[PDB]
Amino acid sequence: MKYVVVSGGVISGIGKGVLASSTGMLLKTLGLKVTSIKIDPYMNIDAGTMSPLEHGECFVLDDGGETDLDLGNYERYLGITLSRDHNITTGKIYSHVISRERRGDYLGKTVQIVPHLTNAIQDWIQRVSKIPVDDTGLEPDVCIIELGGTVGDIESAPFVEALRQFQFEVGRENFALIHVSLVPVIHGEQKTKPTQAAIKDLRSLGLIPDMIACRCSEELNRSTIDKIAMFCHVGPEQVVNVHDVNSTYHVPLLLLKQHMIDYLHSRLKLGEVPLTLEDKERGSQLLTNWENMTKNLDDSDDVVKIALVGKYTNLKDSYLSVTKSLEHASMKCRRQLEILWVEASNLEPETQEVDKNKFHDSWNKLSSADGILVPGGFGTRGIEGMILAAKWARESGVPFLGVCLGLQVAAIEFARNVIGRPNSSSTEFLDETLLAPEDQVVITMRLGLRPTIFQPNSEWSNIRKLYGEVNEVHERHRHRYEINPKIVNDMESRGFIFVGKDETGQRCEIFELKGHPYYVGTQYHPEYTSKVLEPSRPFWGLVAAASGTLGEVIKDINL
Amino acid sequence: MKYVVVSGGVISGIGKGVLASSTGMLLKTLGLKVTSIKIDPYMNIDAGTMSPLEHGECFVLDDGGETDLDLGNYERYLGITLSRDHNITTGKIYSHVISRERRGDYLGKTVQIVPHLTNAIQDWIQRVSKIPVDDTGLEPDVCIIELGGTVGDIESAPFVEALRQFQFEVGRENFALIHVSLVPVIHGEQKTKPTQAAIKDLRSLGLIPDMIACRCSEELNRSTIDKIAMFCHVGPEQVVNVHDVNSTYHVPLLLLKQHMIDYLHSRLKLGEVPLTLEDKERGSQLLTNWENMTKNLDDSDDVVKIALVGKYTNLKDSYLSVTKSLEHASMKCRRQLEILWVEASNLEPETQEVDKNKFHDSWNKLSSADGILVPGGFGTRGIEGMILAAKWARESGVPFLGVCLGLQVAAIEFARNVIGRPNSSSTEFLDETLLAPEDQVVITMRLGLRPTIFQPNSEWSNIRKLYGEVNEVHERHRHRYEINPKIVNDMESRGFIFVGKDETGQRCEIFELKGHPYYVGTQYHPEYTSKVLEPSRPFWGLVAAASGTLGEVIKDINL
Amino acid sequence: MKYVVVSGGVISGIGKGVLASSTGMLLKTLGLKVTSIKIDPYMNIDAGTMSPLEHGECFVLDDGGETDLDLGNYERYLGITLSRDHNITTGKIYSHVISRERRGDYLGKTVQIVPHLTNAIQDWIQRVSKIPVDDTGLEPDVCIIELGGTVGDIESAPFVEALRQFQFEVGRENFALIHVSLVPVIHGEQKTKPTQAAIKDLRSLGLIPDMIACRCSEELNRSTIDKIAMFCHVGPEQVVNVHDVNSTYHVPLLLLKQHMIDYLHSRLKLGEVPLTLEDKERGSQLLTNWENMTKNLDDSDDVVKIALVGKYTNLKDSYLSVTKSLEHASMKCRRQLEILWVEASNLEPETQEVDKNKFHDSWNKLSSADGILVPGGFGTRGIEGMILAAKWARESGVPFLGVCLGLQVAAIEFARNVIGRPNSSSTEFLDETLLAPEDQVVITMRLGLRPTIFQPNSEWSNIRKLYGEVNEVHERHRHRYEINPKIVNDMESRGFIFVGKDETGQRCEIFELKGHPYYVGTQYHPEYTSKVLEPSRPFWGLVAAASGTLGEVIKDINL
Ligand SMILES: Nc1ccn([C@@H]2O[C@H](COP(=O)(O)OP(=O)(O)OP(=O)(O)O)[C@@H](O)[C@H]2O)c(=O)n1
Ligand SMILES: Nc1ccn([C@@H]2O[C@H](COP(=O)(O)OP(=O)(O)OP(=O)(O)O)[C@@H](O)[C@H]2O)c(=O)n1
Ligand SMILES: Nc1ccn([C@@H]2O[C@H](COP(=O)(O)OP(=O)(O)OP(=O)(O)O)[C@@H](O)[C@H]2O)c(=O)n1
Ligand SMILES: Nc1ccn([C@@H]2O[C@H](COP(=O)(O)OP(=O)(O)OP(=O)(O)O)[C@@H](O)[C@H]2O)c(=O)n1
Ligand SMILES: Nc1ccn([C@@H]2O[C@H](COP(=O)(O)OP(=O)(O)OP(=O)(O)O)[C@@H](O)[C@H]2O)c(=O)n1
Ligand SMILES: Nc1ccn([C@@H]2O[C@H](COP(=O)(O)OP(=O)(O)OP(=O)(O)O)[C@@H](O)[C@H]2O)c(=O)n1
Ligand SMILES: [Mg+2]
Ligand SMILES: [Mg+2]
Ligand SMILES: [Mg+2]
Ligand SMILES: [Mg+2]
Ligand SMILES: [Mg+2]
Ligand SMILES: [Mg+2]
């Protein structure tokens, strides 16, 4: 086993999550079975209690574990599947050892937070890094630990102590620390004193740093690096600069130009880890897929405009997984992406009574879009705008994907505007009216990776061509409310055909509309399973249809 | 006595010197006899050893004390005269107490740096703040101490201890601390953790802060101030923001909008200091002169271009006092200033053999200028360019001021190009040739405020009109080399008339050329004596002649 | 080259000087040419200005450098000769670099205390550790640096930074840090939190510790060591305990039982240093001399009582070198030592008018003594008591040594009480009387190691037998006042024979009285040249005469 801990910061907004998700990617190019752990200093047990307004979207794992965003960034960069244990939190570990007290397992000793709770952290990291994460049950070679918060805090405090002991309870040369740090620029001069005042605290809290990964606004001066290597004890080759480049998928290749694999190969003796040619050649091939997709980003010019239609579009992190899946689908089509933020409530005609500028800008963005996405919203208060965009996408022939709530407004749209029931309703919203035309029903939660089976006649469905025509699809779910299955025999007659269903047959999970270029609902969330080299099939479908050449993508899949 | 200490910083480049020079200005509007002290953590005794390349120009005081730049900023903002004791340094105080050891004055005790050296600091600040600084020998009401370096360093260390004792050895309510601090902005969010990691160190080193003067890139958010007032113990009204505004002469009036006089009047009980109406009404009148000159800057549009002709123009701080004196002269003329940086060596014809672009850009800037300045350079290696600009200024009639070396190249120019001795030379440069046409001689140093007497016939001289026709002028000097007095009887015959001389008659200190709109040499430095409401008379002459209306300025002076 | 820095402390009184003087002794048993450096955070240039009341005696080096006590402890433990450069001080290094500024050697840069002054420290330690110190001009293999003050102070601050850079400017594995630390005991429990709050500061200031040398009141518990090895990163074998044992000459052998040579041999790779058999066998022989002299201390029982007669005897550190030389002489005679503190002014008959108890206790202690010492006092105010003890020692036949002032009161005693001039006087005291019987004269200072030549007839003198009958003696001096050489021809006739003189013949440096068992004056200081295995010959003479068997010691010397 080996560990690399990514850590530090003068400030908590500094962006450690790319250097974690990008260090682990570079180590996966050596062919190593890499894994990752997030530490979050917040008290939440797991993210399911905190709304998407409050620091971004509610992620989903194979377990159903509603979790921190930063798990998702490692899953999509590293190709790995994570579990709800990979998110260490102050909530979890304190709830764990305090529940263990009432169980009695410390034999009625004191449960001081030094010794015993820092021992539970060091045990949890050693459990979790041995859980398998790739397509086979082989245990990881290297674990990337992202230490949330900063080193020099009061929510960080048990973790930085636990990791001082863990620098020895796992031997040095099986552990390395990467310290992210701030180097401000003021009046044209690079200021390395915030960094030198977090190297003092790092040595004090007891870890010793290996890298000094500065988030400067610039290239670091040769004299700036020379002084950081005088005040921190690292050699000047190790003072990596992580400055902005044309997209975040380039960041691994900047770190590779900055020798970071050659340093980590030495500093953790990675030549002593046992690897097969099936490991190593997969490693060096994955490097060439990353060099190819970044070269394709560097000279892709032909734009594709996708309208993302929903509430809270000013909080873009409320959709981080939706955005990132369109970026994967974009780079695979070799069309450059623009996403058009349509704040759905502005499409509703009553907006014309409040501000006409909002009513025109939103319908302008929607009309300009080469493809349309209803992105699995939350709450109900924007729903009429999401219905109008689904009417537009059906009648104007524009490519369409409905995710989760998106499948459900598509059934509501089709009921109101093709089946001809204008009172038909989201039972998710208009409940205590008790009306008969209910497009949905509550069936109290359903979460995690679940099996979707294709219905028998489905051969013609573009969505089934995009899934490689395989009879079953494994994808991640969230929904309380599902389509009322007593309308399905009507929709099945009117050309709205339910391509895919749950294994009991009673629950509807995919539809495709007959006789449209690409119009799909998926009631699972296709966002979360997308990887940077394997875009999620419904999202690859959307960005292909909107680019043209949907047929040529269907060959690239099925060959 | 009262003290305000201006201090702090996450980073040393943060710009405390304006908040010091601008806090003391606001207190002078209450009519208080304000003084100021600079602390510089460097080991230099005094600045005379360190070249103008190395952190800016070599200042001069009335004593001849070659000193830190930051004395100058208080002198010109506050109208005060300082002495070489007002610059506390690590060099000075350690040289003082270690020389005092060999003298024996600690009675053969140990001279630990705690107790005894921190007692010498607390004694020095109490000596120095009682030295008089205004036009009358009245001792100061309030002293502004600017603590150089940062609070949380190893060159700062005896000063922050000395000032912890000084918070009591002078009572609280006779002392206040203003902590300047950094609040970075990253991804659009204001980051108050560098500030909260210098409030921790401040409390630790033992001073307690009063103000939290942030150097953010923005207006501070109401929520940013509320959190800084939660982690520092100041109330939110006291978290002053010191953001950029149209010129640094506005900064006092931003601090006045941010209640800083109303706070300091309370927090130091300044109503208990005895003031006359001659103090108070001078105070409130000086406020209206500052409101008037800042209002004049806000709608002055008519440009005046002054060529500053010399070496090292890329190091603008090598001329900070020259620049600032032109800004005072500008605002008094009500013309907006552009200074044209002419790197003098580019005017020399040999530059045409090296790069024609440099030869044209430099002569273009010089030809475009409404007035010309030879700014008292250092060394000799650009001198031929400074001679060509003096030839141009004489023959093309353009307004001219030569400061120090500027008077001397004007005599060399006039000798080569009007008297007709083309071999005549700077004895400052071409020494061991031993030639007879020496325009200068060494007479080993001459420094500080000295008396210049006008020669008898001088009545017609525009420079004597600008000095109010008063028979003697008191101004600050630096020169090893002076005009060879055996050429003067020739220049006096050719219309180059030496308007002013030293009290012995043997040394030449001012000239004005007959029959030119404004062409002056001054061998003293007129820069250093300029105040923000009293621009230095030769520099007011230059910016007036270049603006036109030199006659109207001569009425504004003599009425 | 190799360095071991001895450092640290929660408190400054903790006793680092034995662990320094005893680590270097253990390394000298490997045969290495060891040297040592003292750092003193005080501002004194050198100790000559600070009186023996103020933190102990005024030491003397071969240079004449009046220096810190702690040089002496290394000289006598390690056999080495030091120079006044081996005492780094805050006074010296700041006086050095600030004098270097007025000389100009930083080329007119800023002389910040970071970079430039910490570079002067790192240069000074690298100069000084290459100066030779043994009987041949071979440069040292290992240097012990004793860091005075504590790590976590403001007088320490440039040294701990300089030593962070010096951990790299000399490579790791050529440097090691030993951190002395406090482990209090309260209510019967060992408290390792003062230690854990100086390991935090050590890591912060940037050095990393190797040893954790606790000054507990007890043996450290196995659980106390296990927790210190959990919070500091050292392994539990390295947490040395330095508790009290029967004399400080045992301390090296406790550290040798605690593996400290086996650890330092590994941690500095001391097997790679080139050694001859003449080095190594001298090393292992010196170990057996230390095992022998400590075994002799463990079962020596026969007491010898030496009266030390002088002022300020309550300040025993005012005589630290005098005490330590008697301990060497004691262990060489194999008699256990008691020193009788005679506060000399109490022997004066006027004390009988003030307190009879003082008059009896002091004469009781003097009468009880097996031998008598006048220990080179300072000032004059106790002199009549020192004369009465010299009268007693001459007439009652008791063994006597006069050091410096001791030789001079012996001449004054002999003049008043054998030559018969009762008005004869110390010209050091009774000056402006201008009397003719002056026993002394001023000849303005005379310091350092000087050559003493024996006068021709001297063969019979016990002092010349103790010096091995060698014609010249090299020993360290301090005296303004010396015996008036115009009395010598009288004393030479009366049996007070001047055995030794300065090379000019004009100055008198040793006498021995004819026809007494052992009665010696030495006007040099014999204390400072004594080593733990080579006691100073006059002091070996005194403790031998007082033990009996002075003849048997004269064989042990001359064989
Ligand atoms: N490989 C990555 C990593 C991060 N991000 C972006 O980074 C964001 C949030 O910043 P991040 O780098 O994850 O760190 P912070 O949120 O600043 O938090 P912390 O510094 O506490 O880890 C999201 O907007 C996401 O789009 C990204 O686009 N690609
Ligand atoms: N740990 C440190 C670093 C620097 N200094 C001193 O503080 C002065 C001012 O600090 P600065 O020169 O700004 O050093 P930097 O570390 O570069 O600060 P910044 O990065 O903000 O420019 C330096 O000249 C130096 O003498 C200090 O006392 N302690
Ligand atoms: N009233 C003021 C104060 C400062 N400056 C400008 O500020 C400069 C240098 O910055 P300063 O504010 O004096 O502080 P720093 O040099 O950053 O140093 P420190 O923060 O260590 O005090 C010069 O360029 C000067 O033109 C100015 O124009 N007007
Ligand atoms: N002294 C502090 C301040 C904050 N926190 C914790 O650290 C987390 C991340 O710090 P941050 O939210 O960034 O707080 P700020 O002080 O604003 O940091 P910055 O100014 O850099 O944004 C906070 O949610 C809080 O729980 C802490 O442990 N100790
Ligand atoms: N080998 C040694 C070392 C020290 N001492 C005794 O130790 C004394 C002073 O304490 P020391 O151990 O030298 O250290 P401190 O004075 O406590 O100072 P510091 O801890 O600052 O080094 C003297 O009384 C001296 O007799 C000794 O007898 N033998
Ligand atoms: N660095 C540390 C060490 C201990 N503790 C906590 O503080 C409690 C009380 O400290 P103590 O048990 O006394 O630990 P020691 O380090 O042994 O303190 P001392 O040596 O003074 O007994 C411990 O139970 C532990 O939970 C802590 O918070 N931080
Ligand atoms: Mg925050
Ligand atoms: Mg993050
Ligand atoms: Mg700097
Ligand atoms: Mg400044
Ligand atoms: Mg003390
Ligand atoms: Mg000591």
Residue numbers in the entry:
A (entry chain B), B (entry chain C), C (entry chain A): 1 to 443, 456 to 571
What does the paper say about this structure?
CTP synthase (CTPS) catalyzes the final, rate-limiting step of de novo CTP biosynthesis (Lieberman, 1956). Each CTPS monomer consists of a glutaminase domain and an amido-ligase domain connected by an alpha helical linker. Glutamine hydrolysis in the glutaminase domain produces ammonia which is transferred through a channel into the amido-ligase domain, where it is ligated to UTP to form CTP in an ATP-dependent process. Budding yeast have two CTPS isoforms, Ura7 and Ura8, which share 78 % identical residues.
We determined structures of CTPS filament bundles formed at pH 6.0 to better understand the mechanisms of lateral assembly. As we found for the single filament structures, Ura8 reconstructions went to higher resolution (3.3 Å for substrates and 3.7 Å for product) than Ura7 (6.6 Å substrate and 7.0 Å product). The Ura8 substrate-bound structure had the same architecture as both Ura7 bundles, but the product-bound Ura8 structure had very different interfaces between filaments, giving rise to filaments in register. To better understand the nature of lateral assembly contacts, we built atomic models into the two Ura8 bundle structures. Ligands were clearly visible, and bound as in the single filament structures, and the longitudinal assembly interfaces were the same as observed in the single filaments. Yeast CTPS has a 7-residue insert (residues 273–279) in the linker region that mediates the bulk of the lateral interaction in both bundle types. In the product-bound structure the linker inserts near the tetramerization interface and packs against Pro236 and Ile225. The buried surface area per tetramer at lateral interfaces, 2202 Å2 (substrates-bound) or 1676 Å2 (product-bound), is comparable to the 2460 Å2 involved in longitudinal filament assembly contacts, suggesting that lateral association contributes to the overall stability of the assembly. Propagation of trans interactions in the Ura8 product bound structure with filaments in register also results in a curved sheet, but propagation of cis interactions results in a closed tube with nine filaments. Conversely, Ura8 forms bundles with radically different architectures dependent on whether substrates or products are bound; it remains unclear what the functional consequence is of having two distinct bundle architectures.
